[PDB]
Amino acid sequence: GLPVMNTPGSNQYLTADNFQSPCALPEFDVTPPIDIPGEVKNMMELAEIDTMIPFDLSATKKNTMEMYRVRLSDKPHTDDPILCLSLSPASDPRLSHTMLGEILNYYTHWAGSLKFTFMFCGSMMATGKLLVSYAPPGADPPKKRKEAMLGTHVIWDIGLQSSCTMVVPWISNTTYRLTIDDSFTEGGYISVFYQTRIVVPLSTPREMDILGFVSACNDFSVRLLRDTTHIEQKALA
Amino acid sequence: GLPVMNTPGSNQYLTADNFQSPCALPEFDVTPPIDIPGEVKNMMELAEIDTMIPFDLSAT
Amino acid sequence: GLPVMNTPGSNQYLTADNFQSPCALPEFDVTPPIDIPGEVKNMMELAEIDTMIPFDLSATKKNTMEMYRVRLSDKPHTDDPILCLSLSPASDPRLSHTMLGEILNYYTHWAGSLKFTFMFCGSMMATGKLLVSYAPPGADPPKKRKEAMLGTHVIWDIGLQSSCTMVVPWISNTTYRLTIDDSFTEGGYISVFYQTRIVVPLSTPREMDILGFVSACNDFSVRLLRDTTHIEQKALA
Amino acid sequence: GAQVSSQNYTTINYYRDSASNAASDRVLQLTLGNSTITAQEAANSVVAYGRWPEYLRDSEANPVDQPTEPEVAACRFYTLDTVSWTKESRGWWWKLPDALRDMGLFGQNMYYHYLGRSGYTVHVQCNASKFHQGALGVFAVPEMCLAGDSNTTTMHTSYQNANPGEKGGTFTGTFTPDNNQTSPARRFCPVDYLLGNGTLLGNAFVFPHQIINLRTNNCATLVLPYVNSLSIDSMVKHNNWGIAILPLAPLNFASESSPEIPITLTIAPMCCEFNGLRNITLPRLQ
Amino acid sequence: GAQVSSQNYTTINYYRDSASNAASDRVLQLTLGNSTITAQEAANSVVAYGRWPEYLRDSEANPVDQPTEPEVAACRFYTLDTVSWTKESRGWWWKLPDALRDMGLFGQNMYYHYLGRSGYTVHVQCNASKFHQGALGVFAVPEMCLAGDSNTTTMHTSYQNANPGEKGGTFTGTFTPDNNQTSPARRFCPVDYLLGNGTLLGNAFVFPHQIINLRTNNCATLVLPYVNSLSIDSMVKHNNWGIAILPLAPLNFASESSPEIPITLTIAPMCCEFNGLRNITLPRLQ
Amino acid sequence: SDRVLQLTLGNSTITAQEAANSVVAYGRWPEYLRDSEANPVDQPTEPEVAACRFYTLDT
Amino acid sequence: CATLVLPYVNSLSIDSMVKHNNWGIAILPLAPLNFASESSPEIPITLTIAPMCCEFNGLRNITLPRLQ
Amino acid sequence: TSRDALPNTEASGPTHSKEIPALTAVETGATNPLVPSDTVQTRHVVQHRSRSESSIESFFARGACVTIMTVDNPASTTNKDKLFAVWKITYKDTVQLRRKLEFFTYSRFDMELTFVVTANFTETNNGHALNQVYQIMYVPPGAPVPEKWDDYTWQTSSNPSIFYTYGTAPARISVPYVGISNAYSHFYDGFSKVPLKDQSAALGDSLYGAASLNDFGILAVRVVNDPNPTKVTSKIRVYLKPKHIRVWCPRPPRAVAYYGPGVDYKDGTLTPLSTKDLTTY
Amino acid sequence: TSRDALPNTEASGPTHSKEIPALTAVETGATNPLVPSDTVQTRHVVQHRSRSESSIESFFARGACVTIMTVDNPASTTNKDKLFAVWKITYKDTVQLRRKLEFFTYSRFDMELTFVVTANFTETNNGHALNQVYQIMYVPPGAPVPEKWDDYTWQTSSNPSIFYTYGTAPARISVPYVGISNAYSHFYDGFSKVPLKDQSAALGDSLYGAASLNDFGILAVRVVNDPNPTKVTSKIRVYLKPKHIRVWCPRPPRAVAYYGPGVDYKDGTLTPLSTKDLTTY
Ligand SMILES: CCO/N=C/c1ccc(OCC[C@@H](C)CCN2CCN(c3ccncc3)C2=O)cc1
Ligand SMILES: CCO/N=C/c1ccc(OCC[C@@H](C)CCN2CCN(c3ccncc3)C2=O)cc1
Ligand SMILES: N[C@@H](CCC(=O)N[C@@H](CS)C(=O)NCC(=O)O)C(=O)O
Ligand SMILES: N[C@@H](CCC(=O)N[C@@H](CS)C(=O)NCC(=O)O)C(=O)O
């Protein structure tokens, strides 16, 4: 019949191919779908939801409930940092197991802005002011409010609104960043400081906690699907 | 001639497949059908007929 | 299904074939290009740039900086040649490692005109006249100004303009010439002579240098891509 | 018959089956039946997945007989027991519709029919003073499956231990495997920081949820529609929702070493309907 | 949907990805900021690749924050040190933006931000008498990578030795491998006739260039746009351009055995802009 | 309304929940120097975001 | 908190910033601090300042004042 | 479409106003939809990136191994029974696709199965064998299951089958959505029986989370050739690709090792997080 | 288009004028665009030649070997571990394509990879083996790397793979432009870290010219069959063809032998030119 010629790649199996194959159950009567709440169309829809950050991965606090709480007190004012965090959303131990980190560990490249939200869980009789800072890479990581004050920052005044949001904008030399620890695509640094101290009246707890969440903005994207290191196996079934 | 590429599932036999094959008796003169009573178009037509139930399946 | 017949050449791999194959990364989000200076569309664009010729490949001058300079002096007039060069742009040792020669060593056939440019690097107080000659093949190579004066030639007067250009036109029996040493497609001869001598006043250097460059014209072309002998290997990686 | 698209390219379907084809806010009042709720310190309210409860439509109804819709007789607020929040608490959980199995006519209709469906309104109440601190996370989980207490068998939790009723259960901070081979306990062992099902608590905010922060609000409200892979199902075999309450920040008061405050739950069925009337079911709940 | 072309023949695309598809002159004056240059013996000027420096456009900007454009405060002529040309000289090299790292406010802006970009104007000055002879080749190389001095390791040049600053480096006529295994020098060994990177000097005229011939002109001017595979980058990690000066014909004067003349360089940034402000960088340059 | 305030300069922001409004001295907002009042003749420098930003002194 | 917006004030259009100070900020306790019954209360005060519409003229080598 | 570019960034200057977008309240249960323009001065950027590769179709467009089955053709000079393989259809014998799927509670999808077959000799004897053929038969629930490698059940009058010749391209078929519900249930919080007070304790017992919603039959694989004097051992790898997929009710992903077909976890595996100081970058 | 013919030659007679096109100045930096008609008397010629074969697309339209990988299936009667191959993707293991590409500074192109597999026996024993199948898996950066030939990483739930049967046509795939910059960088004049005075000397050290712009993952190759009584050794040759290619910033070509992945050269190889007398043809 028709003369044909076979080309390279014949009789191979590529797991990413897209071809038609015969149906093993012809004329099957398929059940129709109903309207169920909670349909998802993109995986980036799940990365735009805030999830709590396990800041305190101490040897005695990790793998417990105490790892999500950051302790504050009414001590005299100091310029030392409250927490320090490197912007590696997929490889930082404190960011890799959040929902954003879990989704990023299935991909190789990411880009976009982030937002960190902090919530204060003290008494209504407590007051204070804090400083949340982000520093692009290249210089020494900030260790004093004096240095952190030179990068991007927000001043959080604790009142009726008990939450603050800080947006980390996209400041990169490449169009995408790798989801591993890398010097050429490092992200920067994040820290929290006391602007003033925490002040309480008598008959009030002098120690409190804050909680933190991270999520993505509407200009965030990923690419190059891959496999994760967060699940493994030794025996079949 | 035409460049082609073979895909997975080549040279397999699936008993539920639907393909054309060559005819071993070309130009055969087929007998025409007549009108016979009792033609069936669906198997559900036979399930809509009542049939007796063996209720008493005792050992005897 | 459709009856087909397989023809010779089925299940072969030809490295010069042009066929479609399945994509291993479907739906990948490709980075867009930007406007970078210095885009190249043809390899002949690089052959039309002048590059210096290593004329003096002496046992003590080759593989140094002295091989690019041709020495001139103010000696009494003579009819002996200053330099002699055979027109083999790809196999001549003095032309094979220029940019034109490097590009020609990737091809089997070439055709077109050439241009040689000479620059004088003496004092502003020096004067002279030179004779640049090209002779088509078939006769004895010129060794005296008397013989060189019968072929194509230019007379270079050294003044405010310190450079001269001589065009070697396409004079061939075949439509293309081979890029190897061959008697049936030999190119001809090129030489330089003193028309008058070099004259300087007192308190001036009596020895100077000239530099030479070669490039192609706008009617130059090549064909039959091949491999070069200018790179090799012994061990992998 | 070929389809031309852009990348242009051409595609053709060869088979007859598509499978073969290549691919203000602080104030709130609620009224249901003869019951009302008021709130003066609220953080608004949450409608799960943006969908309000509704009745089953004709174009999605599996059973053919006429359903029963009690309405006001069963769509009303029922108050469960009150739990005590102290500094040693790890959290509590409930199953729906399991927690309303003994609630007026709702339980009677539940145990007299074979199929039923319903949505819910959940209202959690907890108040303190301006000198207390703490935070609670309230999560609604569809198909809230908990892990067992056995490392020699899986999925061996008994029907009685998985359905505690309106009393509910509690989370624990440690996993204690049961080792009695002769008399296995056959009960859950839910760990708080794993949410009782092997997933990290920090991500539980993917589910519908709210937070009660003692310095901001004192109540939480969640509106849950009916969720399942079927239009209607058996309410006595299968639980549709689970409610989990966990302390995100421990309770603390002035300088006392043993503060305590109560937490109360009120739940209202919504748009509930039933099918398949027969004699009443008498489960073995002990 | 088939495409018909001429050789006629027909082609069809089978896949959705395009990857799958089968394939007067002597006189010059320059003014920048508060600085001016005049020249009376010039050979015109060269604009590299025929492209003038420009600012970054919105349709090609990676970072999202507002950039800084110092303009006159940093776009001005800076004069580096002066070198001495004798009969034993082999050539000199400089890196850009490395040579301007201590130049007024340009260096401050460079070390205070994380990203930056800029073009340049380079002016080389060398004058002699009508009784001197010689020629210099000035080349501008994008991504000017030099070879090391070690035959046991590769790419082992230290950050300090690769960034000399405004003093620059020099070429050598011979390759001398370093043999100190205990205390490796970790520095370049650039050979002049190989252009320091394994390619013949005669072909260096592929790069933008000019020639100073002592009997014709006494200055050279090169205008360099910003070149890189990125829209903007880190100026402290990566050098965009390299300037190389080599004697094409040795210097000679009358009958003296040791003539010498100075060579001076002046460089001006153009259309420079910066992004990512933070605390200042303090590199280890010794 | 008057209790709430937010300021944004360059890469720095400030929020306040208990404020008494704000004061503009003499009812005049800062502005650049106009051509009809400029003494020097050379081109000025305007760093803008690089220098117009909030700096925190000691406490 | 308190917020003050200061325009540029001087008898000249532009001047030397290293010789002359344009503004002074003074903070004084109008009523003394007191807390419950403690005899030694204390609270911090912080200042944040932002330049606005700043411009410069006359570029030269940098000034190195004697500040000690 | 998913290949539509993301929104552009807008230029924003200095601001001075009473409105505070930064401060918020997370007790409500919502997420603050801030953009970079609300906190810093930004420039205008024309956006080019898109979210085409993170869609639900793209996230599942790969073939994942779900099982490895073993068959053999024994020596003619022995008494061993010929071995044929039976496998109960499920995606829970492996962990990668299981973890990817259990990001959600419900799903619908068509399926594509690919079979890769390999064989080898078992004894050093130089004995030979002719090319082998394999029969793969799908037995739905309630159909007779084979007991010998050559009994009548292999006549396949109504069960679909594939006959595969060794050395050719790997076998492939496609299946539609074949559930008895309106979607697949990745999780089921219930039982299949309700115990009754009148009845005995054992008559009402059932396993937790098990339902007949997840009974799809078995695959039976045999070598159709008769035994040679030498033994030949073959393994078949099954690869599953879901297509035309829709999902509902996202869930947090698994954080500890799987233990059985349920949500149970094993002691000694409950420490997924590593150490890191609070004030260390 | 590139197939357009070159300009015709024009007739020119004797000339006598003040204008001098021959004399020029090369100090400016330009090239004199002379034609033969400016120096000799010429005739009219209709031109037919074209520059279609020297375009950038044509200069790179061949498949070049980039690596040879080695795998084996060992004997069943030994203790040797089964060998699988790992290769880091790069074009710098060979010299021909590297030299062709390094004529320029930057480039963009799609890629086409072809795999040619060959096998042989290692021992004189007459033992036999059945046809083998090979798995080729692409592991991008950050994904788990296999450590045994049969561990879980080969399930390929998200990594693309090719399964190749021996004796069939060589395997082939195509890849788009997958860089994180706007073009590939053949040369990079910089470092990845900046050392800091406060920090230690070793904490800022990095290699010269190395950046993460050139990290593309690895290819892992294994034999999927189980070992036979006899050993079989296989080699896979990889051939790379760039298509739809664009280039920027031409450079002089390499003149001395390559030494490592940088621009370094080795002593004793710096004499590329031969001898030739000045006045000898
Ligand atoms: C001879 C070759 O013919 N093969 C035909 C065929 C036909 C139907 C087949 O059944 C396909 C059933 C799968 C679509 C079921 C996959 N899923 C859906 C959800 N699920 C599951 C299992 C356990 N717990 C929860 C969910 C699954 O295992 C298999 C093969
Ligand atoms: C299972 C088969 O699937 N294979 C898929 C696949 C996907 C992506 C792959 O990566 C391709 C990366 C190349 C396009 C990179 C080539 N280049 C670009 C420049 N470059 C390089 C290397 C070192 N120094 C400078 C430049 C390179 O090596 C390879 C295979
Ligand atoms: N056991 C029979 C051979 C098996 C056989 O012939 N089976 C028949 C009837 S039970 C059959 O239906 N075989 C199915 C098949 O193998 O295709 C024997 O003693 O040889
Ligand atoms: N090592 C196992 C065999 C390897 C195996 O079965 N691996 C399973 C689970 S670790 C797997 O995922 N294999 C991947 C594959 O080889 O396709 C044995 O002792 O036989």
GROMACS .gro file of N, CA and C in nm, chain A residues 81-109:
model
   87
   81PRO      N    1   1.800   4.102   6.734
   81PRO     CA    2   1.685   4.053   6.657
   81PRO      C    3   1.600   3.952   6.733
   82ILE      N    4   1.473   3.947   6.696
   82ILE     CA    5   1.380   3.850   6.753
   82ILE      C    6   1.384   3.719   6.675
   83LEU      N    7   1.384   3.725   6.542
   83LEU     CA    8   1.399   3.607   6.459
   83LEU      C    9   1.474   3.647   6.332
   84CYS      N   10   1.544   3.549   6.274
   84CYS     CA   11   1.620   3.568   6.151
   84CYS      C   12   1.584   3.456   6.055
   85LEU      N   13   1.565   3.489   5.928
   85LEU     CA   14   1.516   3.390   5.832
   85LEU      C   15   1.568   3.424   5.693
   86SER      N   16   1.629   3.326   5.627
   86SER     CA   17   1.678   3.346   5.491
   86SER      C   18   1.570   3.310   5.390
   87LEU      N   19   1.560   3.391   5.284
   87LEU     CA   20   1.453   3.377   5.185
   87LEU      C   21   1.488   3.265   5.088
   88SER      N   22   1.467   3.142   5.134
   88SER     CA   23   1.479   3.022   5.052
   88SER      C   24   1.351   2.941   5.071
   89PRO      N   25   1.245   2.975   4.999
   89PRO     CA   26   1.113   2.918   5.031
   89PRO      C   27   1.104   2.767   5.016
   90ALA      N   28   1.196   2.703   4.943
   90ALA     CA   29   1.190   2.560   4.920
   90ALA      C   30   1.296   2.481   4.994
   91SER      N   31   1.406   2.544   5.034
   91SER     CA   32   1.516   2.474   5.100
   91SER      C   33   1.541   2.520   5.243
   92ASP      N   34   1.483   2.631   5.286
   92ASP     CA   35   1.497   2.674   5.424
   92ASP      C   36   1.420   2.577   5.514
   93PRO      N   37   1.483   2.521   5.619
   93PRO     CA   38   1.410   2.425   5.702
   93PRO      C   39   1.284   2.482   5.765
   94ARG      N   40   1.277   2.613   5.785
   94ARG     CA   41   1.160   2.677   5.845
   94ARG      C   42   1.055   2.717   5.742
   95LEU      N   43   1.083   2.700   5.612
   95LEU     CA   44   0.988   2.733   5.507
   95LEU      C   45   0.959   2.618   5.413
   96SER      N   46   1.035   2.509   5.418
   96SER     CA   47   1.024   2.403   5.319
   96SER      C   48   0.902   2.313   5.340
   97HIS      N   49   0.846   2.309   5.460
   97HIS     CA   50   0.733   2.222   5.489
   97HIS      C   51   0.602   2.298   5.503
   98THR      N   52   0.601   2.427   5.474
   98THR     CA   53   0.477   2.499   5.458
   98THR      C   54   0.412   2.459   5.326
   99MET      N   55   0.286   2.499   5.307
   99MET     CA   56   0.215   2.463   5.185
   99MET      C   57   0.287   2.517   5.062
  100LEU      N   58   0.332   2.642   5.069
  100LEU     CA   59   0.409   2.700   4.960
  100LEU      C   60   0.537   2.621   4.936
  101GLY      N   61   0.606   2.583   5.043
  101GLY     CA   62   0.727   2.504   5.027
  101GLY      C   63   0.700   2.365   4.971
  102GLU      N   64   0.593   2.301   5.017
  102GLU     CA   65   0.558   2.170   4.963
  102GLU      C   66   0.529   2.177   4.814
  103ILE      N   67   0.455   2.280   4.771
  103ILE     CA   68   0.425   2.293   4.629
  103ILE      C   69   0.551   2.327   4.551
  104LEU      N   70   0.639   2.409   4.608
  104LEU     CA   71   0.762   2.445   4.538
  104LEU      C   72   0.856   2.326   4.524
  105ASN      N   73   0.850   2.230   4.615
  105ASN     CA   74   0.939   2.115   4.605
  105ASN      C   75   0.902   2.020   4.492
  106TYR      N   76   0.791   2.043   4.422
  106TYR     CA   77   0.758   1.968   4.302
  106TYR      C   78   0.805   2.037   4.174
  107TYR      N   79   0.870   2.152   4.185
  107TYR     CA   80   0.911   2.231   4.070
  107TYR      C   81   1.056   2.273   4.087
  108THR      N   82   1.115   2.319   3.977
  108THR     CA   83   1.255   2.358   3.974
  108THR      C   84   1.276   2.508   3.969
  109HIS      N   85   1.182   2.585   3.914
  109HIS     CA   86   1.198   2.730   3.903
  109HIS      C   87   1.076   2.800   3.960
   0.00000   0.00000   0.00000
